Amino acid sequence: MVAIIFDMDGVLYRGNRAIPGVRELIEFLKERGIPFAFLTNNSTKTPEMYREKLLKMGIDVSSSIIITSGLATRLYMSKHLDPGKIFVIGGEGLVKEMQALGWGIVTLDEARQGSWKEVKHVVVGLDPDLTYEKLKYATLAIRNGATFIGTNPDATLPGEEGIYPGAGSIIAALKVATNVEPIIIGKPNEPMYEVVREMFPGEELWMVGDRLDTDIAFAKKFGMKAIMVLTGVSSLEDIKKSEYKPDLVLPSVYELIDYLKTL
Amino acid sequence: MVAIIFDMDGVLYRGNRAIPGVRELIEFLKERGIPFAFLTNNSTKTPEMYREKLLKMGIDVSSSIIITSGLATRLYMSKHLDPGKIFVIGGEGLVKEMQALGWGIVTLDEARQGSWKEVKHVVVGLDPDLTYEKLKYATLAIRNGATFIGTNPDATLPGEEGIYPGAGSIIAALKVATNVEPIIIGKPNEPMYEVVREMFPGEELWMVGDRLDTDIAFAKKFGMKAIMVLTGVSSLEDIKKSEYKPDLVLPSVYELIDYLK
Ligand SMILES: [Mg+2]
Ligand SMILES: [Mg+2]
């Protein structure tokens, strides 16, 4: 009873470009009864927002099978930490997930008044509007004993003008400023796997991605079939100089159909 | 003869107050014509600004002997790099030093037009007004071949409310985003030593500092007499596990007077 987990950007679509055959694949998985879920390290957007983006790319799926690092972070906090006030560095998606916890968020303004002193958890995701001030209060809070949580490790992600700094870039700065080892939630980390597992309890899991350092590393560390597609960031060549080795390489997710039909 | 190089914070003063005996010492060095300079890894301030801070404490010196990491960065660039436009992440101090190079600075507005591609050198120091946008263009430029230069390795520095992120933390974010090893100027790195060395040709150098991991490491790596004072960050106990060891430990810079006679 196989369940397939798909990374999004570079797998189900590429930027603002649709990848041919994705709708067919998804229509096929439903026909075969094959459960699936989308898993993105990006924490700037909600599952709902992602459902809309997917629709625009010719894909219709429930936001219920869309797992973002932000939602994984909320689930991790709820299950393994003690409720306390949160200071957030990140976008709308992440703020919304933290608000949902209902633990209470210390705003930048309250922080300026000294409330960083009462922060129990610091959550860091990709923040396009990052400022030194934010790094300052996050550092003060983490140094005061606040949990240091990072949504994902990605050093970078594509931007309009080229390769832009990712959450890992921001998390790295705080690691240096606090001298504290962050708890990273997303791929290729265990908290993310815990979330996938919770959704699909006893299934044989397959991971389909385009990044070796996150997607493939994730599959190998947790025993998921490591399937890499070539529609994204990685190439056959990157495989060799990488510690992570795909169990299967396909041109795109469309080819998953005949792969599944021929066993 | 002998030239004395002093780290500043934790040696000549603490935050806002001069350490006792520092005024006598400085006046003593001047009377004897003993060469000396002040060295700081901070690049947010101009040497002139430091002079004023020191004078208000009764510490009277020339701005020409106050070497900031920004000043050291300029001298390293002129000496070892080929002239090219610069993109700067840092405060007034560093911006001013980069201007003095006369190589041309790409501002955020120019970078917004796409001029980040014309950046030949990216210089990164402590920037209290850091923004993701700045990190973005610095990242793009470095990925486009621009030199990745960091003013100092300092992970943190003292702030009003506690320990704040230092230049090293900003440099770390860019190292991760670019996958490029930054060339670090400030102590214990060699570029800052090269600057001091060239300032006092023919002089035996003594380095006076309060940090084992930066000042003492700096002295031992480049052959300066490593003098540690106890008025700052490091303590005697810290020496045990420290990689580099001081040649001499003094309670403060004041106890230095008898040695010079
Ligand atoms: Mg991807
Ligand atoms: Mg010091």
mmCIF file of C-alpha atoms in Angstrom, chain B residues 106-225:
data_model
loop_
_atom_site.group_PDB
_atom_site.id
_atom_site.type_symbol
_atom_site.label_atom_id
_atom_site.label_comp_id
_atom_site.label_asym_id
_atom_site.label_seq_id
_atom_site.Cartn_x
_atom_site.Cartn_y
_atom_site.Cartn_z
ATOM 1 C CA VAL B 106 26.706 50.724 -6.247
ATOM 2 C CA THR B 107 23.764 52.008 -4.197
ATOM 3 C CA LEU B 108 20.536 50.095 -3.606
ATOM 4 C CA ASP B 109 18.750 52.213 -6.211
ATOM 5 C CA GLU B 110 21.411 51.328 -8.808
ATOM 6 C CA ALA B 111 21.246 47.663 -7.724
ATOM 7 C CA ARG B 112 17.460 47.881 -8.185
ATOM 8 C CA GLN B 113 18.091 48.764 -11.847
ATOM 9 C CA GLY B 114 20.200 45.637 -12.149
ATOM 10 C CA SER B 115 23.582 47.203 -11.400
ATOM 11 C CA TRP B 116 24.276 44.450 -8.893
ATOM 12 C CA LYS B 117 25.753 42.701 -11.940
ATOM 13 C CA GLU B 118 28.380 45.432 -12.204
ATOM 14 C CA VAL B 119 29.522 44.963 -8.613
ATOM 15 C CA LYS B 120 33.104 43.688 -8.471
ATOM 16 C CA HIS B 121 33.464 43.682 -4.674
ATOM 17 C CA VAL B 122 30.934 43.099 -1.875
ATOM 18 C CA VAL B 123 32.041 44.383 1.528
ATOM 19 C CA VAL B 124 30.164 43.213 4.627
ATOM 20 C CA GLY B 125 30.398 44.676 8.109
ATOM 21 C CA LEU B 126 27.969 45.100 11.005
ATOM 22 C CA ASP B 127 24.781 46.689 9.669
ATOM 23 C CA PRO B 128 22.102 47.699 12.236
ATOM 24 C CA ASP B 129 19.890 48.619 9.288
ATOM 25 C CA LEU B 130 20.276 45.300 7.494
ATOM 26 C CA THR B 131 17.414 44.235 5.235
ATOM 27 C CA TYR B 132 16.631 41.125 3.227
ATOM 28 C CA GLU B 133 16.960 43.283 0.115
ATOM 29 C CA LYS B 134 20.595 44.029 0.965
ATOM 30 C CA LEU B 135 21.276 40.341 1.575
ATOM 31 C CA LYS B 136 19.606 39.584 -1.753
ATOM 32 C CA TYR B 137 21.786 41.872 -3.865
ATOM 33 C CA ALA B 138 24.928 40.940 -1.968
ATOM 34 C CA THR B 139 24.078 37.296 -2.659
ATOM 35 C CA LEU B 140 23.431 37.876 -6.384
ATOM 36 C CA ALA B 141 26.610 39.931 -6.817
ATOM 37 C CA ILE B 142 28.824 37.402 -5.027
ATOM 38 C CA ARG B 143 27.256 34.595 -7.027
ATOM 39 C CA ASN B 144 28.081 36.764 -10.035
ATOM 40 C CA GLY B 145 31.787 36.816 -9.157
ATOM 41 C CA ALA B 146 32.027 39.820 -6.848
ATOM 42 C CA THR B 147 34.668 39.432 -4.124
ATOM 43 C CA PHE B 148 33.173 38.298 -0.799
ATOM 44 C CA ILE B 149 34.869 40.458 1.857
ATOM 45 C CA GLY B 150 33.965 40.512 5.554
ATOM 46 C CA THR B 151 35.240 43.213 7.914
ATOM 47 C CA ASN B 152 35.481 40.941 10.972
ATOM 48 C CA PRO B 153 34.605 37.421 12.257
ATOM 49 C CA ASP B 154 32.892 38.576 15.463
ATOM 50 C CA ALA B 155 29.753 36.496 15.975
ATOM 51 C CA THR B 156 28.335 39.088 18.390
ATOM 52 C CA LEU B 157 29.002 42.377 20.180
ATOM 53 C CA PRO B 158 27.652 44.026 23.357
ATOM 54 C CA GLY B 159 24.343 45.828 22.982
ATOM 55 C CA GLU B 160 22.250 47.932 25.354
ATOM 56 C CA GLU B 161 19.875 45.051 26.072
ATOM 57 C CA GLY B 162 22.444 42.263 25.953
ATOM 58 C CA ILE B 163 24.321 40.321 23.290
ATOM 59 C CA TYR B 164 23.519 41.475 19.735
ATOM 60 C CA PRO B 165 24.356 39.851 16.370
ATOM 61 C CA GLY B 166 27.759 40.897 15.033
ATOM 62 C CA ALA B 167 29.253 41.217 11.555
ATOM 63 C CA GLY B 168 30.123 37.524 11.614
ATOM 64 C CA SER B 169 26.476 36.514 11.835
ATOM 65 C CA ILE B 170 25.586 38.588 8.767
ATOM 66 C CA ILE B 171 28.652 37.238 6.943
ATOM 67 C CA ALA B 172 27.527 33.716 7.888
ATOM 68 C CA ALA B 173 24.113 34.181 6.265
ATOM 69 C CA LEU B 174 25.784 35.250 3.010
ATOM 70 C CA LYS B 175 28.278 32.385 3.123
ATOM 71 C CA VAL B 176 25.306 30.008 3.249
ATOM 72 C CA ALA B 177 23.419 31.833 0.496
ATOM 73 C CA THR B 178 26.403 32.056 -1.872
ATOM 74 C CA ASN B 179 28.541 29.030 -1.039
ATOM 75 C CA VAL B 180 31.581 31.295 -1.212
ATOM 76 C CA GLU B 181 34.253 31.463 1.512
ATOM 77 C CA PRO B 182 34.487 35.080 2.657
ATOM 78 C CA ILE B 183 37.837 36.831 2.960
ATOM 79 C CA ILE B 184 37.830 38.137 6.542
ATOM 80 C CA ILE B 185 39.818 41.282 7.335
ATOM 81 C CA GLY B 186 39.635 41.844 11.113
ATOM 82 C CA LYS B 187 41.623 40.044 13.837
ATOM 83 C CA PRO B 188 42.719 37.253 14.138
ATOM 84 C CA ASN B 189 42.894 37.348 10.290
ATOM 85 C CA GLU B 190 46.103 38.352 8.550
ATOM 86 C CA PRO B 191 44.836 41.359 6.586
ATOM 87 C CA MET B 192 44.493 43.459 9.755
ATOM 88 C CA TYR B 193 47.996 42.426 10.880
ATOM 89 C CA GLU B 194 49.440 43.385 7.503
ATOM 90 C CA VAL B 195 48.011 46.876 8.033
ATOM 91 C CA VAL B 196 49.470 47.295 11.511
ATOM 92 C CA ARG B 197 52.809 45.806 10.396
ATOM 93 C CA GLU B 198 53.135 48.336 7.562
ATOM 94 C CA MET B 199 52.278 51.201 9.886
ATOM 95 C CA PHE B 200 55.192 50.487 12.199
ATOM 96 C CA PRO B 201 58.104 49.254 10.066
ATOM 97 C CA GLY B 202 61.111 48.083 12.063
ATOM 98 C CA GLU B 203 59.221 47.974 15.371
ATOM 99 C CA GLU B 204 58.801 44.996 17.692
ATOM 100 C CA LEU B 205 55.027 44.716 18.039
ATOM 101 C CA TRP B 206 53.121 44.136 21.275
ATOM 102 C CA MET B 207 49.401 43.294 21.060
ATOM 103 C CA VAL B 208 47.238 44.150 24.085
ATOM 104 C CA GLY B 209 43.743 42.682 24.235
ATOM 105 C CA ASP B 210 41.052 41.091 26.408
ATOM 106 C CA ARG B 211 39.815 38.362 24.045
ATOM 107 C CA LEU B 212 41.724 35.080 23.789
ATOM 108 C CA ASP B 213 39.965 33.937 20.625
ATOM 109 C CA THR B 214 40.689 37.162 18.733
ATOM 110 C CA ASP B 215 43.411 39.394 20.235
ATOM 111 C CA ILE B 216 45.678 36.685 21.687
ATOM 112 C CA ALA B 217 45.161 34.381 18.710
ATOM 113 C CA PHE B 218 45.998 37.415 16.547
ATOM 114 C CA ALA B 219 49.255 38.089 18.396
ATOM 115 C CA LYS B 220 50.443 34.454 18.490
ATOM 116 C CA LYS B 221 49.600 33.794 14.846
ATOM 117 C CA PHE B 222 51.613 36.765 13.604
ATOM 118 C CA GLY B 223 54.467 37.000 16.090
ATOM 119 C CA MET B 224 53.360 39.881 18.311
ATOM 120 C CA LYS B 225 53.952 39.729 22.057
#
